[PDB]
């Protein structure tokens, strides 16, 4: 029963994390704590809490768990892996550059690069509409959808959560805050969807804004960047590798095509070191 | 170099607090912007810097900065965090503190229960001072606003306030009427709009539409204005407990020309270290 817990505040392109080393510290963090610490007015303030633990499994380097500020063990945009990797390196918990980490969904493989960015294996995309889930007659590269009188062409992709991706001529003037929420809860998305607005600059470079399910516009949705790159490659607009500029900064997406994993590379930054009493 | 800071809040108005008496650092607008960002920084509503006073007859100086860089002149929540900060970091052993601020020297008192009492100064009630367009000073004014009629009190605590009485703050039209009255042409410089529910002469609930901000949850000057408005109109009697969304304040006011004394909490959240 420690007096206090040491933590590091980190962010991956503006998605901000409270990170805890529970390898070296012993404590049982209760849901109560997640909710107290997550509050931006009266707490530390974070999008997610990331807890690093000893591998409860062999041939794995670490375990981690991710909680949102409301206490639930959900991680929509999948950027926490990069903060984890930079954290265990920065805190000298490992000298490995290729790290295998046990997570809720399975095993994440990641690699820390010499320039300090982190490449994360995000798994293959799911493209069959009913699996996304999305209502359509058959799998297609693009779907026509009627949204309160507007006909939109939307690609639908799952990175483990549902995404719809629409191409825009101009990401800065795109209707993110108007059409985002209309598509997010469209009946054809029975579990709702993250909605990406994708501006193609050339086959290897795009700009992206994402309306995140349940949240609104975010600085950098990793799985959204993955989905948008996949959607653009499938339609021939993009070719791997794709540099994707988000409001929070730049991600690099690699995808060799159907059935192959999407690889996401980007930065993760330390903001400050903190101590919070239990 | 590595700077120590403390995160505090007063009724959910959250502060990064820096002791630059014991630490030597040149903090420039660029740092305030970087640290104040909620996505990439510490995250705060305001940065409070504690520094050495210019007068040896004053205990401390502080400066308060918004996340966007601009400096604040008076901030009741910040004064309460400042007081508990200098006490708990052992920078003073006094309970009655005088501090140099951008708006003059203010007197603070740390109570035995750990809350802090701030001298907020007297209210200004004449319309020209608010500023508020009115024929004469009055306890309340009837306003025609977009086909509606509203009765509000107008008070200045250094900034303008309009205060409306409501039967229940939870059903008050804070998001509807708030912005309509905020920019009403009879408030030349806009106004903070308070919605006041009287429980008894000594107890009330409040919600505040802050000008150029919206519903704020922790507007201490709004609580002062609402208590003053209610006391002048006889619905309340000093001292008044004011329940805001962020928590409870206690207001004392002896009447016209006398300062409003505001008492509330200040809470330490965590300790941090940031590279400058």
A175 and A229 both lie in a single domain:
yes
SS3 at position A156: strand
Q: Within 10 Å of residue A105's Cβ, how many Cβ atoms?
A: 10
Provide the 8-state DSSP code for B259. P
The token pair at A64 is 């981690």
Are A273 and B272 in contact (CB < 8 Å)? yes
B122 close to B257: Cβ distance less than 8 angstroms: yes
**Interatomic CA distance for residues B65 and B71, integer angstroms:** 4
A244 and A272 both lie in a single domain:
no
Return the residue matching tokens 């400042």. B82
In B90-153, alpha helices (H):
none
The token pair at B134 is 């009115």
**Interatomic CA distance for residues A154 and A131, integer angstroms:** 16
Residue B109 annotated as binding site? no
**Interatomic CA distance for residues A271 and A156, integer angstroms:** 35
Are B13 and A40 in contact (CB < 8 Å)? no
Strand partners, B152: B141
**Interatomic CA distance for residues A225 and A82, integer angstroms:** 15
**Interatomic CA distance for residues B230 and B153, integer angstroms:** 9
The token pair at A38 is 């997550």
Encode B149-173: b = buried (16+ Cβ within 10 Å), e = exposed: ebebbbbbbebbbbbbbbeebeebe
The token pair at A228 is 């948008």
The answer to whether A36 contacts chain B (CB < 8 Å) is: no
- Which residues lie closer than 8 Å to B262 by C-beta, 6 or more apart? B76, B117, B118, B120, B220, B223, B224, B249, B250, B251, B252
B82 close to B99: Cβ distance less than 8 angstroms: yes
A222 and A154 both lie in a single domain:
yes
What is the rounded (10 degree) CA torsion for B2, B20, B17, B62?
Answer: -160
DSSP code per residue over A239-256: -SSEEEEETTEEEEEEE-
- Which residues lie closer than 8 Å to A96 by C-beta, 6 or more apart? A61
SS3 at position B231: helix
Q: What are phi and psi of B32, to 5 degrees?
A: -60, -40
B252 and B270 both lie in a single domain:
no
- Which residues lie closer than 8 Å to B202 by C-beta, 6 or more apart? B236, B237, B239, B240, B241
- Which residues lie closer than 8 Å to B82 by C-beta, 6 or more apart? B17, B48, B50, B60, B62, B99, B108
DSSP code per residue over A83-144: HHHHHHHHTTS---SEEEEE-SSSEEEEEE-TTS-EEEE----B--GGGTT---SS--S-EE
Which residue ranges of A make up the annotated binding site?
15, 48, 68, 78-79, 161, 194, 212-213, 222-223
Q: Could you tell me the maximum CA-CA distance found in chain B, to the nearest angstrom?
A: 60
Q: Can you give the CATH number for the domain in which B112 is found?
A: 3.10.310.10
B214 and B240 both lie in a single domain:
yes
Resolution (A): 1.7
B82 and B11 both lie in a single domain:
yes
Are B42 and A248 in contact (CB < 8 Å)? no
Closest CA to B179 of B195, B166, B156: B195
What is the rounded (10 degree) CA torsion for A243, A247, A248, A253?
Answer: -20
Closest CA to A15 of A273, A247, A262: A247
Are A271 and B40 in contact (CB < 8 Å)? yes
- Which residues lie closer than 8 Å to B51 by C-beta, 6 or more apart? B20, B21, B60, B61, B62, B63
- Minimal CA separation from A234 to chain B, in Å: 32
CA nearest to B45 within chain A? A41
B177, containing H or E segment: helix B174-182
A158 and A173 both lie in a single domain:
yes
B142 and B40 both lie in a single domain:
no
Instruction: Look up the domain containing A247 and give its range.
Output: 129-260
Q: Determination technique for this PDB entry?
A: X-ray
B138 and B249 both lie in a single domain:
yes
- Which residues lie closer than 8 Å to B200 by C-beta, 6 or more apart? none
B137 and B70 both lie in a single domain:
no
Return the residue matching tokens 């009427």. B177
B74 and B179 both lie in a single domain:
no
How many CB pairs (< 8 A) connect A and B? 58
- Which residues lie closer than 8 Å to B33 by C-beta, 6 or more apart? B67, B68, B69
What is the rounded (10 degree) CA torsion for A35, A39, A45, A48?
Answer: 40
**Interatomic CA distance for residues A250 and A266, integer angstroms:** 7
CA angle at B249 for the pair B244 and B253, rounded to the nearest 5°: 125
Which residue ranges of A make up the annotated binding site for substrate?
15, 48, 68, 78-79, 161, 194, 212-213, 222-223
Burial tier of A229 (Cβ tally within 10 Å: 0-12, 13-18, 19+)? buried
DSSP code per residue over A157-182: EESSSEEEEEE-S-GGGS-HHHHHHH
**Interatomic CA distance for residues A262 and A229, integer angstroms:** 9
A254 and A151 both lie in a single domain:
yes
Closest CA to A77 of A178, A211, A198, A175: A211
Encode B9-45: b = buried (16+ Cβ within 10 Å), e = exposed: bbbbbbbbbbbbbeeeeebeeebbeebbbbbbbbbbb
CA angle at B197 for the pair B192 and B202, rounded to the nearest 5°: 105
Q: Within 10 Å of residue A6's Cβ, how many Cβ atoms?
A: 15
A83 close to A12: Cβ distance less than 8 angstroms: yes
**Interatomic CA distance for residues B185 and B182, integer angstroms:** 9
Q: Could you tell me the maximum CA-CA distance found in chain A, to the nearest angstrom?
A: 59
Number of domain units in chain B:
2
């Amino acid at each position: 029963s420690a007096m206090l817990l040491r933590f590091t505040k980190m962010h991956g392109l503006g998605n901000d994390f409270m990170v805890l080393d529970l390898v070296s510290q012993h404590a049982h963090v209760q849901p109560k704590h997640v909710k107290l610490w997550g509050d931006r007015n009266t707490g530390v303030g974070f999008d997610q809490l990331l807890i690093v633990e000893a591998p409860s499994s062999p041939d794995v380097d670490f375990r981690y768990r991710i909680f949102n500020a409301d206490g639930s063990e959900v991680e929509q945009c999948g950027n926490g892996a990069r903060c984890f990797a930079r954290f265990v390196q920065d805190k000298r918990l490992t000298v490995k550059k290729s790290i295998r980490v046990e997570t809720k969904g399975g095993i994440i493989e990641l690699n820390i690069r010499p320039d300090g960015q982190v490449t994360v294996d995000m798994g293959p995309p799911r493209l069959a509409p009913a699996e996304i889930p999305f209502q359509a007659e058959r799998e297609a590269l693009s779907y026509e959808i009627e949204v309160n009188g507007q006909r939109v062409e939307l690609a639908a992709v799952s990175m483990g959560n549902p995404h719809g991706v629409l191409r825009v001529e101009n990401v800065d003037s795109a209707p993110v805050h108007s059409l985002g929420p209309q598509l997010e809860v469209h009946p054809r998305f029975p579990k709702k969807a993250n909605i990406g607005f994708l501006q193609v600059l050339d086959p290897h470079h795009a700009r992206l804004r994402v309306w995140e399910r349940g949240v609104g516009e975010t600085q950098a949705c990793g799985t959204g960047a993955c989905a948008a790159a996949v959607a653009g490659i499938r339609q021939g607009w993009l070719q791997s590798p794709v540099q994707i500029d988000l409001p929070g900064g730049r991600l690099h997406i690699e995808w060799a095509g159907p059935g192959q994993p999407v690889m996401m590379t980007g930065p993760a930054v330390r903001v400050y070191e903190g101590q919070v009493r239990l």
